[PDB]
Design a protein around this ligand. Structure first.
Ligand SMILES: CCN1Cc2cc3c(cc2NCCC1=O)OCO3
Length: 164
C-alpha cells in the first residue's frame, strides 16, 4: 500500500509536465509519510511553490528547500529534522528518489531525483521511492542545470499532491 504522489513543474513560468513518484511506505514508512504530507500540504507547509535549486546534469535534481530556497533550509512534518530510517533501498539508477542531508540523522524536506546510478550515496542517503512516470519531465529539469548546480531558468513546483 504505497502512495502515488505528483509534482507539477514549471521553468520560467511555463509547464514542463508532471512527475509521478511511488513512495516506498513498505520499506521506509516514516520517510515516505513525510514526503507524502509535504506534497499534499496538509500540515500547513510543503513543496507547493518551492524550487529545484540545485540541478546537476548526469547526477541529480535537488529540491524541497521551501524555507530558504537555497539548499540550507527545509523542515520535516515531525520537526526540523528526523533520523535516517534505514538504508535498505539503494541508489540503483535514474529515477531514484532520495533524501538530501547534511550528515547522519539530518533529514528534513530536501530531496533529490537521480538521473544516473549514484551508488556512492548508498548507506549515506535514505532512498524512499522512485519515478513511476514523467522521467522525460525530470530530463527537462536536468537540462536547465549546470555542473555547478545553478539553474539557467527558475524551476518551480507549481502544484503537488497525492494520486492514491
Ligand atoms: C542540517 C540543517 N537543517 C536544514 C537542512 C539542510 C540540508 C539538508 C537537511 C536539512 N535538515 C532540516 C533541518 C536542519 O537541521 O540536506 C541538504 O541541506
Amino acid at each position: 500500500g504505497n502512495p502515488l504522489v505528483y509534482l507539477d513543474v514549471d521553468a520560467n513560468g511555463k509547464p514542463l509536465g508532471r512527475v509521478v513518484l511511488e513512495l516506498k511506505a513498505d520499506v521506509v514508512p516514516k520517510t515516505a509519510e513525510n514526503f507524502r504530507a509535504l506534497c499534499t500540504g496538509e500540515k500547513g507547509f510543503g513543496y507547493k511553490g518551492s524550487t529545484f535549486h540545485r540541478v546537476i546534469p548526469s547526477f541529480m535534481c535537488q529540491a524541497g528547500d521551501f524555507t530558504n530556497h537555497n539548499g540550507t533550509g527545509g523542515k520535516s512534518i515531525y520537526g526540523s529534522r528526523f533520523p535516517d530510517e534505514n538504508f535498505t533501498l539503494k541508489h540503483v539508477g535514474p529515477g531514484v528518489l532520495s533524501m538530501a542531508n547534511a550528515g547522519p540523522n539530518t533529514n528534513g524536506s530536501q530531496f533529490f531525483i537521480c538521473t544516473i546510478k549514484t551508488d556512492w550515496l548508498d548507506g549515506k542517503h535514505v532512498v524512499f521511492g522512485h519515478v513511476i512516470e514523467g522521467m522525460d519531465v525530470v530530463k527537462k529539469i536536468e537540462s536547465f542545470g549546470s555542473k555547478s548546480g545553478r539553474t539557467s531558468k527558475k524551476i518551480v513546483i507549481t502544484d503537488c499532491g497525492q494520486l492514491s
